[PDB]
């Protein structure tokens, strides 16, 4: 009964998240294909994704529970197809800004993917359900990264054909959503829900902040003329590390009623100490291992939060609660980026940035580690 | 306003060598991929070299390769270009350019579309 919805949902997730063209976006757009300058791509195109994402997250989390979810997953599929068609055949700066608007729609509509399954499945399959859905996306990301690396180097695959492969992947994914079963017909009062959302809001803002500077840190630490190959490979392995960590959450029989918070504290410290290790250590392998632990550890927690939010939601407000938490994370991340990295703010170099990111994650652990009064 | 100042150019008989310097200012020099371009008298500006911000990589044009040694001195916010065995076909106005985005190399921005913030160039007249 639960197998068919889960199978179709994870097939859609795998085929949508498998996109070879993603790691070569900047080389593609600034390359000989589109000829967009670095200043343009960085300041006029890319920001439209953040504002489009921020604005579109509002209707998504406002309505996704009303429309019963499937309409939102289908909309995400169509947005995927439009985005990649424009990427393939769209030339100019305004066209790329529209591409970024539709990608903001695509990512903002992802709340329905994780929200959808708890409406069609019984509460007793929520743990297993949560693990597969997160892992297939990360397994798909790793597979796409490996395929792109092999093709671009071994197959001399041009970025246009990576884009074509990703377009075919998202088209197949769109075809998989038409068959998804349709579900049928101030909520933070619970403290588990409140704290799981608090960690989601703040940890998520920090996580997406690191990802844009890991490769910059690795280059500064160990200047290597072939860093690009190693930077991609470690990203993929770190992404595969969280796929099995996410998968292992749904399989292992552990009483999550008592291990909910305990896991939050233990892996919150591993997210802090892992970041200090990349900042302080001189070996790049120690820095590579730090990223693997940080990304794998975070994805272990993001799986428990979604599972542990859905369990304590009395009302079927899955997209509201998930949608708010990824929106407040967007606000936090955008504010923090301005303070820390932006020239308008402090303009910290990557040398010290991870002491900020490292301690920023220690503060998160500090709040959760100190909730025991006697 | 990123300000760059090319110095070093001048007449040099063929076979001698030169060193130009470009003491960049107004930017965080230790984060930007600097470069050197030239504009021969009757053509368009053409990439010559580009030293990544880490300094571990130095791309070069096919013609110059093997004679040009781009460098950088982050202490002095300066970059150099040693030009050895100069042939009359190297004559140009040598402009130093700064990456319009700090970590261009790490984010994999095409080099020949990554450098702006031009200077006012220095004249090299390789006189056979
Ligand atoms: C990018 O520049 C190259 C070289 O000038 C040119 O051949 C190409 O057509 C340009 N981009 C496109 C596809 O318009």
Author numbering:
A (entry chain A): 11 to 195, 271 to 459
B (entry chain B): 1 to 128
Give the authors' words.
The human SLC19A3 (hSLC19A3) transporter is a twelve-pass transmembrane protein of the Major Facilitator Superfamily (MFS). SLC19A2 and SLC19A3 are the main transporters for thiamine in humans and mediate the uptake of the vitamin with high affinity and specificity (Km = 2–7 μM). Among the known thiamine transporters, SLC19A3 stands out in terms of its physiological and pharmacological importance, as it is crucial for the transport of thiamine across the intestinal wall and the blood-brain barrier.
Using this molecular toolset, we determined the structures of hSLC19A3 in its outward-open and inward-open conformations, in both apo and thiamine-bound states. Nb3.4 stabilises the outward-open state of the transporter, while Nb3.3 and Nb3.7 both bind to its inward-open state. In the thiamine-free samples, the central vestibule of the transporter retains some weak densities. These originate most likely from small molecules of cellular origin, buffer components or coordinated water molecules. The binding of thiamine follows a key-in-lock mechanism, with almost no structural differences between apo and substrate-bound structures of the transporter (Cα RMSD of 0.30–0.62 Å). Our structural data further confirm that recombinant hSLC19A3 is N-glycosylated on Asn45, whereas the second predicted glycosylation side, Asn166, appears to be glycosylation-free in the wildtype transporter. The cytoplasmic gate of hSLC19A3 is formed by hydrophobic contacts of Tyr128 (TM4) and Ala395 (TM10) with Tyr403 (TM11). The gate is further stabilised by polar interactions of the side chains of Asp75 (TM2) and Gln137 (TM5) with the backbone of Ala404 and Leu405 (TM11) and Lys338 (ICL5), respectively.
